[PDB]
Write a protein that binds this ligand. Sequence first.
Ligand SMILES: [Mg+2]
Ligand SMILES: [Mg+2]
Lengths: 405, 405
Amino acid sequence: MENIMTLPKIKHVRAWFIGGATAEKGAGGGDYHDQGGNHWIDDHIATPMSKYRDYEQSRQSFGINVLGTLIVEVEAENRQTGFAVSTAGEMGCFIVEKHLNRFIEGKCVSDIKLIHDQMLGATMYYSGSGGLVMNTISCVDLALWDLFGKVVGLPVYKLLGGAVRDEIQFYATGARPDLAKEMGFIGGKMPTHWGPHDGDAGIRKDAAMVADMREKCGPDFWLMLDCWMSQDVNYATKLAHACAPFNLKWIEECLPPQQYEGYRELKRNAPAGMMVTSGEHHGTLQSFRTLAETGIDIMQPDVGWCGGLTTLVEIAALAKSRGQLVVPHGSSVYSHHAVITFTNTPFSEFLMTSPDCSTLRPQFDPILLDEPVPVNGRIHKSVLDKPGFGVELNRDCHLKRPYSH
Amino acid sequence: MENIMTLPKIKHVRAWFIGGATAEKGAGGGDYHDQGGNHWIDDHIATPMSKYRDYEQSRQSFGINVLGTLIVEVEAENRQTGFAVSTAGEMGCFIVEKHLNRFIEGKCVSDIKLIHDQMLGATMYYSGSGGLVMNTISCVDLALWDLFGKVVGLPVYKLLGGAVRDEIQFYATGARPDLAKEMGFIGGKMPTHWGPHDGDAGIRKDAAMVADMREKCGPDFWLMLDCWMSQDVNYATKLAHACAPFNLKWIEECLPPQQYEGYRELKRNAPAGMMVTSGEHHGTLQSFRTLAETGIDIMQPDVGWCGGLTTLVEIAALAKSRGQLVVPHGSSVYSHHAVITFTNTPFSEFLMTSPDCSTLRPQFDPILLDEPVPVNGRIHKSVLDKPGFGVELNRDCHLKRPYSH
Ligand SMILES: [Mg+2]
Ligand SMILES: [Mg+2]
């Protein structure tokens, strides 16, 4: 047998950020919500805070954009690099440069799972199993997979065992399911604009929004509702039943992440055939074990928030073992390379970054160079035939390096 | 009726830090683990990382001390101030100065619960329900209660409805239960030094450690084991049964926080009469609802990590409703003022900050001025008869202010 390919050790790990409270607001990139004004993603979206008059119209007003984008780049001894982006910004840089670097530098570029376990174990006392700290860990994990793929010379999807479908079909999230249908998407997920404090009027208005789009899009184009942790079991139950006549495919993240018991009850109360989903804010495989056992239909981890690709692959197996689907939240290429290899991820999400949902602005615009976007609502596997996650870091963005080591 | 006491509005909120990766290592204060060398708290303590040779001897080596102390001070329009400390450091300062300040400034000093709900709702998308972000929220909550108490002129324990006992009796956590007995404590909790990877030898060694202290302390002095998230169900079960002959009162935090299902199984497998506890790393009332339902005997939230005093009081009611006890993790005065009013907190914890557990070095030494310490293993309620949490900020420490607004 031939001698194996020689692999370099990891030399440096660096972290930068753009956007967030200490940089330029509206930088976009990794933080989906770090947008400018007049953006659908900030237009009276129901949230745990919209019950407050001062925070009802804008999520930005309560600080959904304070973190900004975290960028992690790992450089091997042979000078090759790999990178990834997520939501964490400056604080994410602290974690990487002042803590996690000790487990990263000096390792082989193939020691991905090892570094992953060490990051989880070393931060367990302050990670809270999700959110900020997990977003940071996820970003490092993705940067490592990117570097490994670029060193080996293969797309991440091939390293994982290959594609199980020739193309990824997408549904679009935004305020214009009708325009999404025109673009070729298979469905459209809309955000709810009213919450529990709005009562029956709120239910009537969001249900009317769904009815209107059903009329405009026809019966086969899927329609879904995203509730961004803004409701309670009763309100979610009433809304789901109010939308049943229009064949709403699923109602998403109705409750805060810790409310597993509530999700179990909500799923039990759901109209026959209508799915209940959640997961974008959950982190760690164990949390997904608990979430899966509530009986919800689809878990939706964000690859950059759940713990990384390493964790995503485990979550996919968990769901598959139960005969269920896993449909990641956004994530662009970080999701594409993974889900195209998952038999139980028949479709993916494309979260509209276009202010009015009329164009195909890239998912992480503009931090990723040559970022692929759906063509006729799909991304063919050949589009992913590039090393690692197939993109390059846009250094024309004003990247800030708050910490060093 | 007389006109009510006039209350000022909150003018400023400021955040500082000491210790941590960007300051002086070993600063102590809020971060219990930010100690120097030769400290029992870093002496081969079993952890999720001790299975790794390079991280077996020292928790500091894997970074248990990177955060340091977060200090939050709230100033009212009448110039009176209130403050609190916790574990979060520089990153905690970012959260307070760049995000949470918008919900704090301008409110009445009595709007504590309102600010609390807004902090939770606004950070839900990145808090992960515990850890770093929750520690920060908790610190703000405590600072608010401190300010309110100082403005009103009453100790927090009286504002809460008064003491239900004349003194708080303590058990001591550290490597010397025998010295703790001499000091007047009612029991001693020791850390385990070996983990699953050590197998039967590890169980034999930690059990022998317990047997030795039982011999030295007698039958009535309580002995407990702290496992700092380092085990799995089987190992914890074996260790608990190995310690049953010595009447180990309880075995604490055997599993990582997300493993609710494991805790349920462990409690079921526990020797008759032996308690199973956890909770110091959990956050948010909902997580404690789930933890409580696993059947464990005592939940141990840290007042500065679980969400604050506001959350602690709710957790106490949850436990009380189930006929169970709540015994907070460390927390000094932040716990004292609360638990002295809880019928279901018959005793409290004093975590030895003394390197060799031979003296009564204050719990948060040296960031808190005039910090009370147990006398004969107890703290009489009269010791707490000072405004707010009864202490002042030691500004002789080199406090750093990384952010402004
Ligand atoms: Mg969603
Ligand atoms: Mg403990």
